[model samples]
Target: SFSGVVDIIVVRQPDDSLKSMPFHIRFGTLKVLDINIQITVNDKKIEDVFMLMLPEGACYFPELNAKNEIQKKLRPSSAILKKFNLKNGYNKIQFIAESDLQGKQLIEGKIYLYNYDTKLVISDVNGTVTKSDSTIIGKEWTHDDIAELYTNIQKNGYKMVYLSSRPLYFYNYTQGYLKGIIQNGFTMPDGPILLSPDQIISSEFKGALLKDLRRVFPEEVNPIFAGFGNRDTDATACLYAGVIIDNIFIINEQSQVEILGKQEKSSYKKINEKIQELFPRLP
Candidate 1:
């Protein structure tokens, strides 16, 4: 039920020659599609080779040197949504890459299901989100696509910020957390800052802090993700959260980063930091 057909594309070099040497190639503007890739350096005819296509929707990336085995590479893009019964309304898509040379390249494609009323579910089975996953020393950041938008907003001469609802403690206090942020190329701001989830004191005090936040920004606040912790209401509370608070758009798994493609590594870190930077304080 969670698959799509496989597609193979043979690309030729600009010259009528083969790309035998150490070559650098870039894919075209891709939206999101399940892709399997195989690269051959020798002089081989495209059709003389084998091609694997999946009709029921499950395809694997082809091995570079393995013969006849289809290696599943790219994940489905937004254009491929219908193949998975993804309906309208908000949907959260999670992608986790394989750690052990699982595949060569990841592809993305999208589908539009305007009439088909089905819930779209996106999951990254391996806990990998963006290219940044390959790096970063410890912990994880909720930031992803928004960092670029923030920069664009800034370049236009407006004060811009990236924001997320990740628990405050996840960012400022945790050990090795600073390394994750710094390794990903994030710098702290030069202004008075307000953050939470520090030396919790204890869960009891944490709840007290939450209560205070609710009283102040009740209208702007919501719950965390379900299973995020002992909080049972996160999934339900997320319903109360709005997508946009002034200029900061709420980004969960649904935000679209179609413009940058695989280059989202550094930007993801910025998004995580901005979330902490922009949100109105809990005091």
Candidate 2:
């Protein structure tokens, strides 16, 4: 199932008339992470709007230059990160998705604006949190304790990031799907949820993604406190991002923890208590 939403911004002029304009943002070719917008006319209000895709570190460089912006750090001067309203914490967003499915509609979502030094506990979504059951009367299932665990981790001071490898077109499905989890009361913390630019997943591509994150947000600036996954590639990605081996928690569907490595069963119940220690909240 798919959904959409459309909003119109109105302007008032000296003639006392109302005029409205519409716009949107997306992710596909360039791996759009987030976008900022403000629409104002001769006499009107400025509604700052942003369009973003999955992924954390990507920047939309409309101009082609030798410097590919995604490879470096996006400071305050950076375009996308500039208007994002991060009041010393999460990047607050009200993503109103729009589409024409023989008619008009909208889907709402959110993104995070993390502090330069915010450490993250990145986790996979498909197998990491999702379960094997099909939609059972409108409710999708994930391992037990996930809802509780993620909330607690963020509560303990670490930011949360949800990572998935689905293709560009699947963005809505994945975004909406994850959103559904919380509708069923599975509330994961707010942060950026990333997807693949293409359908295929490659270790090289993922490794680079991790490396890029490390570059702009170095260990001192930002660190991957831990990673959760279910495959060797997941382990590889964590290590590539500089997450220590001990901090990478993997598991099989049987809920058997993977030393460093899929599709069956696992739950956060096993190690939910491990993250309770460390880190101060003075930031």
Candidate 3:
């Protein structure tokens, strides 16, 4: 079930009154069953006007350059909408999906909704996920090599950990990533603790966490809480104050890296190297 809301912006001058313009919709091939749309004002829903699709694949790309941008990270999905046009108002939309495994109809059913706004915003961020489920460690296995890595984890005393940039309570994507790690036979920690996207670490939380890391793990667990929030100068303060391990890992969804500045990437690279250096053979 694909569902979410997109704010539709009218393509007319602010002062110019709007008359229904020629609107169109483009969709990917995800076995789209039917589409439901509505017009609204403020938080109110306008029910008289609506658009519906019988059955097909994709929905539409509201944001320009969306196909090009997402294609860089993922292959292009099949699109299905013939065309879509509508007047402005808040729109609550949903899609009834077809089956999965039909080739172009392999219906992972990840739909993209394009509103008439300046920049198109996606409604729901739900899709397939993978998990890792192996508990092995050995010195003979090299962390970099798949075979060697798995073997080492089976024999070694270390556990694996996974972190990501997902919203709080966004369990689907989170579970999917974990499932991938498992299905791929990747080594994992005792447990993967998911970081919350909604939680912003203020200076106070940083200070408190920094104040506690020393007492928690004297051996140094650099990978435990390496999330991507406030990792620049502000984050550096916490690290310098001996609150967090110098290395922190940030998490993001498939199409999310473009927004992060150089600071986060640089810090992640530096910290990862430092940790790897300490455990050269560990992956």
Candidate 4:
């Protein structure tokens, strides 16, 4: 059933502090499967590092920090390849993955790498649009305004990029949940789902991605980027990513805030209500 493309990114940090490193993968159902990875960059073998065990689902607004502040927030099954300096233009990456669960070589893929760039809406998955659940064992729920959010995304010519604090291996549950919601008439649009790496905290992971995005697409100054989230970390990370505070939509109303936090600043309108305010004539 794992038949989709696992879009991999060779991360280059914003400060030029890193190199072509770590094949970041996005795939379905990697929860039960154990994998052994071997990767070569430009025909040279790079040593890989193992990561700690990670959760099987996304994290949301819950437990607070020592300062009692909301923390936004993978490990592998590690196959993190060592850093390799790559020049701009075309390069080749060869990879082999063997499944420890199945006891067979399950993945053999080659990547022709080039610059990956984007400029668009950055949205959160859990708590923002979907109902925030404490566990990942059952059917997922949605916020009432999920339909409105999807409709607006289609109306605007903006591309949706889903950034979740969910672990990378939990995409199976995530996809199934989305499928159910869409089947029930939620106008969900397709987008890239970026899950957090094992062991990295959500806030830092999100901050790093946004920071690198600006550097990668430096020509597009004053890029149109808006964010939607429910927790303090979402608001905090979006602001940290240099998104304008005004465009940052937080869904924490008074009731939600009682648990989420109280130092709220953004307007907490439900997406549908907010849409009405923005486009009074739209049906």
Candidate 5:
């Protein structure tokens, strides 16, 4: 039996209306599986959707509000899963919702999907992980360092979770940039690249996603081992999500951002060596 998870965020306009948007689901191997759906808006579980229309079929939710949102998970029918013929690679899922907005307006939230077997290395993408210095033009400082680190971690059995404050509109560009960097000699575990919504604050966005990852993954099954980021938002979010300070690495701490947890510091040139020290057992 195969099983997977899908996390979605619906963007609501000022009138409490949700925009029709499409999200991608990438997977390897061909098999029939049950996909669990988690939908939220601004870090809050959406409790009012009428139905989710997928390639397979539509799954409906009632108007009941329970104490546990997990109770509302939508499991697509087996016949629907069979219709998709989910082959190797990326499968885009378009969501159409029919609901009467009851004073709740939404404006996007990060969506995540992965198997339960994946161990996550939650990382920030942009200025913190990716070099954003304006002076260097194409010289993304030590761009290969984190990639190489995550790749090795993957080899040791973990999945990369790329988290960024960038909006979902930049998905293609972001994926291309990361792909380009990795192809240029860096190594990265192929996994979900999560982006923030337009209205959510950066810290709030990152913090919420990390918390969701922690919540969904069972302790004995999918473990979160490391978090990488440079900015204060990264550090703060990682700590807020219960990531150990010892496992959190902060890059270029001159910003003097206040983080509640202890962290290691390194420059772009020295990050690789620092990372090696942290995971000395990995050959």
Candidate 6:
């Protein structure tokens, strides 16, 4: 029973609108869902019009768009809250995508709720968290320091948000690794683990998600805090989100930004100490 749908999102030459699926939102708010279609022909990617089936359970309604193939508005109103028991703090839900081809695709994802003023540190998945890119089975973190660091961050009153450039197809593996389901896997902080909706993963793709986040968390007023990743693109995206150059950390065993420097275990140790003071929340 193969239930996973392969995300064949190609890079550079594009047709689809890059949108990371919404997995986290302010406790009280509505989110917009934009759509675009992509088709690859030989050496080039094609963009064209398409339609999305809005099942009654999808929580969104479709509308025609001038530029996009389809535009939808998702309302996670009280009706949805009660379904997920979104009694507050954190709420998680499983989303299903059905197709004539994929049948009923069960993608496990969470819709998180948080305070706008809370501190959030966005991080990349692949190499930034894993010892290397694509740490699928028996995964390890960039190790010992990771789970420790994130634990302390949460204990000290900060929330961790992870973003994956991988498609939703790997959602289970990606989420499992973060949850430390494997014997010695690194346990990540409990937060929204977002996957990319972009056909391609680039700084532009990530940056747009960060930009869209401002809609939920006020850019200047909120403590969006820092960005963590091992790639230069991650650094660029972090900067685009207005995380201070100093606030962005590269764990590049794999580093990014000329000044940010590579993060070895010692670097995580150093960060552990100053992290509590980095945000304005600590009046």
Cand. 5 Cα-lDDT: 0.48
Off by over 4 Å in 2: 1-86, 90-109, 132-139, 182-186, 199-203, 219-222, 259-267, 277-283
Best by TM-score: 6
Model 6 C-alpha lDDT versus the unseen true structure: 0.51
What ranges in model 4 sit over 4 Å off? 1-22, 26-118, 133-135, 198-203, 253-283
Candidate order, TM-score descending:
6, 2, 5, 4, 3, 1
The candidate, 3 or 6, that scores higher on TM-score is 6
Residue-by-residue lDDT tens digits, candidate 4, 124-144: 778766656236664666666
Estimate, for each residue in 154-230, the C-alpha lDDT of model 2 and write its tens digit: 88778767777765445556656665666246577766665432432221666665665555453354367788887
lDDT by candidate, in order shown: 0.26, 0.50, 0.29, 0.48, 0.48, 0.51
Worst 10 residues of 5 by lDDT: 1-10
Model 3 Cα lDDT, one tens digit per residue, 1-283: 3222211122222333231211222224445352443323323343443333334322332323645552211111112121222323323333332333432211111222222222210111121121111222211122222223322332333333223334332334443433344324543322223232233211143344333322223233232322223224334533543424433222233322111323343322233344444223432
Clashes of 1: 43
The TM-score measured for candidate 2 stands at 0.61
Query: Where does model 1 exceed 4 Å of error?
Result: 1-146, 150-211, 217-283
Pairs that collide in candidate 4 are 58-166, 73-202, 74-197, 74-198, 74-199, 75-198
Quote each prediction's TM-score: 0.22, 0.61, 0.26, 0.53, 0.54, 0.63
RMSD of 5: 12.7
Model 5 lDDT, residue 151, Cα: 67
Q: In candidate 2, how many clashes are counted? A: 12
For candidate 4, the 10 contiguous residues with the lowest summed lDDT are 73-82
Off by over 4 Å in 5: 1-117, 133-144, 182-184, 198-203, 219-222, 253-264, 267-271, 274-277, 280-283
Ranking by lDDT: 6, 2, 4, 5, 3, 1
lDDT of 6 by residue, 95-157 (tens): 343344434433323445555466678878778777566435644545346676676777767
